[PDB]
Amino acid sequence: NSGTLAVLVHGAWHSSLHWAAAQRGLARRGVASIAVDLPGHGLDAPVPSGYLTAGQPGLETEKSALADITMDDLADAVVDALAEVRSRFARVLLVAHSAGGGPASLAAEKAPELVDHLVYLAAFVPAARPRFTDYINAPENADVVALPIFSDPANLGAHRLNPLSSDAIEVDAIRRAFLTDMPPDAPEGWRHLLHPDEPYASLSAPVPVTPRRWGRIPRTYIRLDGDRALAPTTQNLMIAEADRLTPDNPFGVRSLPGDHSPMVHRPGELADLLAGI
Amino acid sequence: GTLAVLVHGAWHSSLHWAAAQRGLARRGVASIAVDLPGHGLDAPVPSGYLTAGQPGLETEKSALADITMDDLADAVVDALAEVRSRFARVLLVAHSAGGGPASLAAEKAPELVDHLVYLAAFVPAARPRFTDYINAPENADVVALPIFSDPANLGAHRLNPLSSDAIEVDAIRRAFLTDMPPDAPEGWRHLLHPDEPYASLSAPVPVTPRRWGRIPRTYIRLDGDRALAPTTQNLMIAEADRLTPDNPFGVRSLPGDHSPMVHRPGELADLLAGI
């Protein structure tokens, strides 16, 4: 693991900060790691003009500043990060979580030489269906906790969530979807560490990958069996459908118990898993 | 085989190092960022912090009231102990109030640090409390932070970047992010934490010249700092060097504001990689 680097790509509404504890776990095994902040996430992220204002005026109608972000912009940010570290490490592992699988996969398609192994952590695999919504709305995913995404995401230019809502039922839906295994008396800092706007392209734009570029990279899926945001059945569906398109290079399959956020609630064993890939 | 362990400052978290971490990887320097107790995803919020009008924010006792300076330092030691056998060279980089816990951690376990970097950070060698330097005459020129009154009774030094008073919010911006472009996004406002543990700025940090004082160390002064005066940074350097005449500070510099890992992450990473 002396020359292995894990490039971590966060999921929708999250950022690089959610990987922090898992990065500590990886270092404990001598695995260096960096976390990419996709456009619209991290310290650079915007918020709607009323998101931090009492009453939250205009939140349901204001157009998002992320409306013009394309799927290629998200992938090219991953390509840029992979390109900056390629000459420094012999083995580069691309680790994507949830919606990050789109941009990570397209980056591996654009530049397969920059990626030595793909790791999908309950993430979107665009091999068989190019849009994440193609799986989110599939019958296998009907039993997940329905996220309170704002109506008409195409017009806002983003899939909008409101963890700062005064509606405790609304906030509790986000809580149960992402952080199901959270202790009953846990701190509430996570509420203002999420970003409200996820670019429309992230969940709704097609991600075209081919079996002769993306499909030849060694890859592993990590299924989260207690996932209430993306059903384990949907995760198995993505593994089976993608494998049928690359029969000579099938998915490696690992498994963890618990909710959609093992980097938060199981960072130690997630790092141990990643170091074993 | 070099690992940089990054300790954030007050009201911040590991998140703010992200751009500098990517810059360090460019140069082949691995890095992790520690989240001190009460920061990051572990951070609590007052019950009214996210409520319209923020009721009770001025009086509610903090959940961080019982965190001691030893708790903050022991978290740094625990992080340093996990990576010691995996890297030949461990750089402990502290920013601002992070210098307190990082220095006490280095004093508790000197074999876990090969070099200390103080990035406009508190150096407790000559004065054990950060307020000994914050309230020094050399620091009178900083942008006054709108910290809530009576931090001892609250159990925290409280900041309110979510305040409806634009002047209050702008004072936080002018102190930490003076060089912010004119039309920058607002995300930074909700990525700060309101409560900094009372011990962070007020508790004494005891280090000795034969433990902490023997570790190679560097200070990175920020010349356009409006949160911690550059004069205060030079004073900390000089006063600390008198107590360790055999091991004086290495002194480097960066222009710009108090947040170089936000506004100058490239040159900051070039500096750290060259240490």
Q: DSSP string spanning chain A? A: -TTEEEEEE--TT--GGGGHHHHHHHHHTT-EEEEE--TT-GGG----TTTTSTT-TTTTTPPPTTTT--HHHHHHHHHHHHHHHGGG-SEEEEEEEGGGHHHHHHHHHH-GGG-SEEEEES----SS-SSTHHHHTSGGGTTSPPP-PPS-HHHHTEEE--TT-S-HHHHHHHHHHH-TT--TT---THHHHS-SEEEHHHHHS-----TTTGGGS-EEEEEETT-SSS-HHHHHHHHHHHHHH-TTSPPEEEEE-S-S-HHHH-HHHHHHHHHT-
Secondary structure class of B65 (helix, strand, coil) = coil
The CB density around residue B157, as the number of other CB atoms within 10 Å, is: 25
Residue spans per domain, chain A? 4-277
Position B86: which residue type? R
| A145: Cα separation from own chain's centroid | 17
CA dihedral A187, B262, A20, A39 (to 10 degrees): 100
Q: Which residues of chain B does A51 touch, with a Cβ-Cβ cutoff of 8 Å?
A: 186, 190
Tell me which method was used to determine the 3D structure.
X-ray
Cα dihedral across residues B228, B233, B234, B240: positive or negative: positive
Q: What are phi and psi of B92, to 5 degrees?
A: -100, 110
Task: Give burial (CB, 10 Å; 0-12/13-18/19+) of A71.
Answer: buried
Q: Which tokens belong to B159?
A: 């900041």
Indicate which of A13, A17, A93 best probes the interface with B, i.e. most B CBs within 10 Å of its own CB. Answer: A17
Q: How far apart are CA B6 and CA B23, in angstroms?
A: 13
* Beta carbons of B195 and B151 less than 8 angstroms apart: no
Give the integer Cα–Cα distance in Å for A206 and A126: 8
Structure tokens at A240: 């089976």
Return the bridge partners of B198, or none: none
Q: Name the resolution in angstroms.
A: 2.3
- In this structure, are residues B52 and A55 in contact, taking their beta carbons and an 8 Å threshold? yes
Strands B156-158, B195-197: pairing kind? antiparallel
Residues A96, B37 contacting (CB under 8 angstroms) = no
Q: Nearest CA to B105 among B90, B119, B120, B85?
A: B90
**Structure tokens of A53?**
């204002």
A4-277 carries CATH number 3.40.50.1820: yes
Beta partners for residue B32, in sequence order = B5
Closest CA to B66 of B40, B44, B81: B44
**CA nearest to B94, candidates B162, B165, B174, B10:** B10
Q: How far apart are CA A77 and CA B268, in angstroms?
A: 21
CA A240/CA A236 separation, integer angstroms: 6
Q: After which residues is chain A broken (C to N over 2.5 A)?
A: none
Q: Which two tokens stand for residue B99?
A: 């210098």
Please spell the DSSP secondary structure of B82-99, one letter per residue. HHGGG-SEEEEEEEGGGH
Terminal CA-CA length for chain A? 10
The CA distance from A240 to the nearest CA of chain B, in Å, is: 34
**Taking the alpha carbons of B61, B67, B68, B73 in that order, is the dihedral positive or negative?**
negative
Mutate to test the interface with A, among B7, B11, B22 (most CBs of A within 10 A): B22
Backbone angles phi, psi at B163, to 5 degrees: -70, 150
**Residue B137, both tokens:** 């005459």
Helix axes B69-83, B99-108, angle to 10 degrees: 60
How many CA atoms does the CB half-sphere of A37 hold within 13 Å? 21
Q: What CA–CA distance (Å, rounded) separates A263 from A25?
A: 10
d(CA A138, CA B200): 50
CA B175 to chain centroid, in Å, comes to 14
Distance from CA of A249 to the nearest CA of B (A): 30
Q: Does domain B2-275 have CATH number 3.40.50.1820?
A: yes
> Which chain B residue's Cα is nearest to A18?
B41
Tell me the count of A-B CB pairs closer than 8 A: 136
Cα(first)–Cα(last) distance of chain B, in Å? Answer: 14
A79/A76 Cα distance (integer angstroms): 5
All residues of chain B having their beta carbon less than 8 Å from the beta carbon of residue A91 are: none
Tokens 């909700």 locate to B190
Specify burial of residue B149 (Cβ count, 10 A radius: 0-12, 13-18, 19+): exposed
Residues in contact with B1: Cβ distance below 8 Å, sequence separation at least 6, in sequence order: B87, B88, B89
| B15:A43 CB<8 A | yes
**Closest partner CB to A52 (pick from B43, B86, B162):** B162
